[PDB]
Amino acid sequence: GTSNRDWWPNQLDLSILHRHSSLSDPMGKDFNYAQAFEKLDLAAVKRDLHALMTTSQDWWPADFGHYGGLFIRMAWHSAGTYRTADGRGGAGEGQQRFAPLNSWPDNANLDKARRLLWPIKQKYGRAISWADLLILTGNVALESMGFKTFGFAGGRADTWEPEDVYWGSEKIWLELSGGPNSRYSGDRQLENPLAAVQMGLIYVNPEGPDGNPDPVAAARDIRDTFARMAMNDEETVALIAGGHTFGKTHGAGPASNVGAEPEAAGIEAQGLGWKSAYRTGKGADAITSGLEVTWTTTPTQWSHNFFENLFGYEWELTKSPAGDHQWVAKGADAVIPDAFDPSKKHRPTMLTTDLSLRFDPAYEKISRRFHENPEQFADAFARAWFKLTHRDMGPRARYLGPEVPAEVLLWQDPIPAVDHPLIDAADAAELKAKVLASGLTVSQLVSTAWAAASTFRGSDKRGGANGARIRLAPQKDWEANQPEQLAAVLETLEAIRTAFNGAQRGGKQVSLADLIVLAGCAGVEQAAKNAGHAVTVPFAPGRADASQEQTDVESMAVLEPVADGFRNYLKGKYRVPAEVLLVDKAQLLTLSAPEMTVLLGGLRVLGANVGQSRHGVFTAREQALTNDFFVNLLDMGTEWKPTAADADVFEGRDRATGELKWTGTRVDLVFGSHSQLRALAEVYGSADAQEKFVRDFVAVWNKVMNLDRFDLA
Amino acid sequence: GTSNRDWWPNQLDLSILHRHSSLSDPMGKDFNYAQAFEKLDLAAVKRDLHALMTTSQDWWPADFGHYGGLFIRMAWHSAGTYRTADGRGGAGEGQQRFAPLNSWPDNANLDKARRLLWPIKQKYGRAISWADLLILTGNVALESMGFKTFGFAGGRADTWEPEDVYWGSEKIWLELSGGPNSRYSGDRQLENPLAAVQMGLIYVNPEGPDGNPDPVAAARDIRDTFARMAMNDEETVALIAGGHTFGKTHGAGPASNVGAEPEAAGIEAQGLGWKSAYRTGKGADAITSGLEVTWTTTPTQWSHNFFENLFGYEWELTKSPAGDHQWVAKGADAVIPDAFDPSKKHRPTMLTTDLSLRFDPAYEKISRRFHENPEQFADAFARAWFKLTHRDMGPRARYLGPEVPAEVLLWQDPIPAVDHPLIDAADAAELKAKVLASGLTVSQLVSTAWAAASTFRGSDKRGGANGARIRLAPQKDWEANQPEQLAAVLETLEAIRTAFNGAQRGGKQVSLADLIVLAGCAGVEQAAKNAGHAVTVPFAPGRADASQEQTDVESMAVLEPVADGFRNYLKGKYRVPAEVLLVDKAQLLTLSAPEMTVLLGGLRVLGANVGQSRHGVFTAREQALTNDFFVNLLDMGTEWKPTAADADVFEGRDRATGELKWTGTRVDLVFGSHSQLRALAEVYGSADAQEKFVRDFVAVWNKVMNLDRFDLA
Ligand code: HEM
Ligand code: HEM
Ligand SMILES: [Cl-]
Ligand SMILES: [Cl-]
Ligand code: NA
Ligand code: NA
């Protein structure tokens, strides 16, 4: 069937904003996963998982009699798709069970692992999500094998459809770099927001870059990809060596024996894939990656044998039975156990990427320290394993259950506890009036609260106005945030704050984070008053102020908005058209198309544009909350043409006289061009729509202000 | 960005079932368009529409000073996409304003027409939908030019994204037949469900079949496509001749002057397209189809001139200024007015397809009768214009406003009014006990009510259990309905009915339509009892019984289910895989994926399969309402393989012994294979789900039973 995407393959796609409807969700609209999970008997779940570890099924026999290595790999791949650039990927939505991830080559045979878990999932039902179960099972595998984990939090609710993620533009699985859709340019520069070297890999190629078995060059790719998953050198070494303490790779025969991935397989495969013609197709004959490496002498027990082997041998380049590059220990004895024949042993073996940990000079120093001090290795690995598996969960307020680590970690963007009474409705009224009486304008108030709140992304639940991190490095100096203007606003609000807090009794105080939001609420009310309309904007107190010492500045950099169409802002020129970037930002804000539309039309007339640009300010009553953006954009009396100077800036002239009325960007004008967005603009631009426009603007402003308010969840 | 569709282009698409969520809809979730429309000042709207007729805009100047012809074409194309096969297309959702229809070649410059209507749309806002406005406008155009219409109903609520329609598989606009994705095979047999000859045409090619200017062969295409739009010969002649009494075609210069269609146009085009480089690009210089034909001496007034011209001249094949085939009257004087120059006159001209109305022998007889009896022509055209424009609106109960024709028309599938007291809760309990005491089984009661109710399709709001048409030709003889079994159930129910009605006082009676539905309810209650569960199934009385004479047998044929996955039924072999057919049926039933899933799993265990097939009957307690379907489907103790005899029938064997446990079709097993479906099946197959499954089943069963209940709207 030919589709709109076939005919107009470059038209903007709004369907990413309308996923996750109540239509596709099998749970009722009142289901609350946290409420379910809080009553789960987590101990019982863990005892069933522990038993599973050594209960082999004949359709996918357990290596060494123990599924622990398979389950560790499963959980590491569940988490391992995460990119810090956008927050997308990660284990937090259980997306490994859907396309495309369920059928990535790097996820081969994890269909088997998830199938092994169906009995437990079935037993406990809605009280444990697949998302949570995949991570838990990796923890229980680690515990079963003698490794002490750092902890575990539940609360990842299941999803019901694939997420819309850009995983790259290649049309061939695993394509090597330098093709027509290459994700590399320049001197091996991986395109943002990608965090993997080839389409369908988690991070890097285990043979080496584009298959070249050089451990030093492989180290470069490990470092870059892991940094793009928010891990530093110590964490990276700890994770790789920790993982590879357990289990084995699978490459018993040629890869041409392996059939279709799950999304391509026949209906009778019942959701499994990679069926193999090689001998038994499983167990001793399994083929997963094509590599055939077993790292340690006790693949089912925590040890410090990975580093003992890595440093205790010299390594020779060899080939697996599938023809893939791997390494074997020179002159070694057969000391590694076979996975099924108790009378066979094997020489130590390594991947190219394992040897990176000894041949890259910076990794070698960490690896030596870990070899000499295995306690330090165990602690780093437990910490890194927790971070890997929790990095996309969001604020600690979302962590559920009895095994949550009490230690607050800097990567969590921690928010201090509130230990004092909160302002009430009358206090909030008093503060809104004090803010308006200070002389701060509607545009200042709206712009400041927008800047604070709109760092939130729903991909990994980072950002938002809680913390008042807008007053700290680096947010206070981001271009989009207009650093000098911002500092002036913040000084005025901090003086209101000090005067209000100094007058209270009883311990009551207001945080700066709450006052920033409240002040933006005052600005929105005042703009509505300026248009002739009395409205109250909802506000919920309870935000707290984080310190600079509780803020990792380097980690906060990925939250900078380099394109923010809601402020008509683009920090530089990108290949992706600005309208596409607006829909991307709206998805990370969790907005629907109607919410995006209302919000942007209102922001334009409120004065939220960076630099007070007139682009899209289609009103003669700026700082009044009216639907003038939509009425004026849709007026057929105005003709639009791209300027000579800049093809992405447009002049709006009266069609009869030629007189200049307005200017706009692509982000403004898309609302008059895209057929679905124009239809939305028409509802807000109609003569009956002033009340609707105000109410729906107030609703979406409050939604944005509350995106990180999981303390009210 | 490579997408799942790129990787697995033949995987089934469930997003068609979650279109039209509350996420994409800008109106609040309680907006009721009927209520808005009922308060519209329709007379005011009509006065504004009359004024617009002759208010020419310089960006698209009015032909003859009057936009009536353009607006009639606009309305006819809005309606013209309707296919009787699936009920899809038509005017009823205003889809001409969305892709792909806004950019079809046959809809060229209708973007202009719609833009002319924005000021009225803006003025009246939500109280008139685009969908209603496009039809009303065409009515006002006809009235303005002297033609009395048969009436008008409002109530077409707007939609907010494109509908998912199969329009064909060609990848080239306008592709002629016999290509790699030909919609024609055999002796000019158009593939169902298509109702147009080329991709991006409304019905037929105005030059003739594949561009060959043969009026006789064009007539054949006209007849077949119009019949696929529910129109017979008389209606077809009336509509073509009636339309072509007005306006003109546009082909002032070569088509190569015309630029990108709206979905391809630049952002500055602000939603318009087909900008032309020919001279002034508009008005006298307009290029729409490429043809240059003006049919009558008075193109802005109702006349009898069409048929005077068609019969009064002999016709010569010529070429328009764009090179396209058309006809000119031999030896005629220049009697047809020019659209813009009062000093220019033109000879009469005709399209190939207009000449079809004279050269096809059956159409000639109607055309002559219309030429000789103009009042017959006017009345037939009025009636046919009403049908055209209302054929997809559904039952009369949906018709709104002061201009609704009182006359009941056969094509409306009329349902008599209820003129007696209805059964109450005590009566419903008494009837359900009678039904259960008769010996009708769960399987029979469920199957019969399913058969009755599941004829409904939301595309054109035809079908459903109201009317008790299951007892009439042709429904009573459809194979999917199990005609012998059906007859036996109906006889039993009709005797219950007679006995109950004969005992009443006052006028109270129960219709057979109600009793069939109530009896299906009793069957579901009984199946719950058989599973150990108390359950209450909602029922709403008020259905009435239509007569055979109120049921057009040939129009009913398109409602026959040739594939009904819910009954594991496929009447023959189709090219489209059966699980795609199931999702298509779910879309017509208005079901989401979770409702399709629950419903099918329940139906399997209740005995609703045609012929009592065991395919999918994954329970040892048939006729008990349980979640067994899901629990057994998902049991990894079972291995599935296609049979030798039939690749579309699968055997489920115990994995350890080989013993046969079940058999299933593709429609059964897709719930275990498709990653999104399987995720849904897992929720219902979990150990905590029996109660959820029963309550969700009852809800969706009730939903189906009430799909056509617009008397309760
Ligand atoms: C440079 C980064 C990494 C590379 C290239 C990589 C590569 C792979 C490969 C190719 C396999 C074999 C798949 C098979 O044939 O069955 C695998 C297995 C495995 N990996 Fe990694 N790995 C990386 C990091 C990790 C990390 C971070 C962890 C966890 C902390 C992990 C844990 C495992 C485990 C436990 C197995 C064994 C699976 C089994 O016993 O079935 N790996 N690795
Ligand atoms: C065999 C079926 C039909 C064919 C092939 C056909 C073809 C066309 C074509 C090619 C045009 C010219 C487009 C342009 O260049 O502007 C057109 C114009 C138009 N048609 Fe038809 N037509 C059909 C039936 C209809 C019907 C059923 C109606 C309405 C009842 C209708 C009403 C009109 C009107 C009013 C115009 C004039 C538009 C204007 O003045 O701008 N036609 N027709
Ligand atoms: Cl994601
Ligand atoms: Cl449709
Ligand atoms: Na994420
Ligand atoms: Na329809």
PDB file of C-alpha atoms in Angstrom, chain A residues 171, chain B residues 1-9:
ATOM      1  CA  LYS A 171      19.885   0.728   5.450  1.00  0.00           C
TER       2      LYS A 171
ATOM      3  CA  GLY B   1      16.458   7.968   9.834  1.00  0.00           C
ATOM      4  CA  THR B   2      15.859   4.220   9.161  1.00  0.00           C
ATOM      5  CA  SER B   3      12.521   3.053  10.693  1.00  0.00           C
ATOM      6  CA  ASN B   4      10.944  -0.369  11.575  1.00  0.00           C
ATOM      7  CA  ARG B   5       8.953  -0.137   8.347  1.00  0.00           C
ATOM      8  CA  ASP B   6      12.203   0.119   6.377  1.00  0.00           C
ATOM      9  CA  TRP B   7      13.707  -2.946   8.070  1.00  0.00           C
ATOM     10  CA  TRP B   8      10.564  -5.210   8.110  1.00  0.00           C
ATOM     11  CA  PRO B   9       8.308  -3.678   5.408  1.00  0.00           C
TER      12      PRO B   9
END
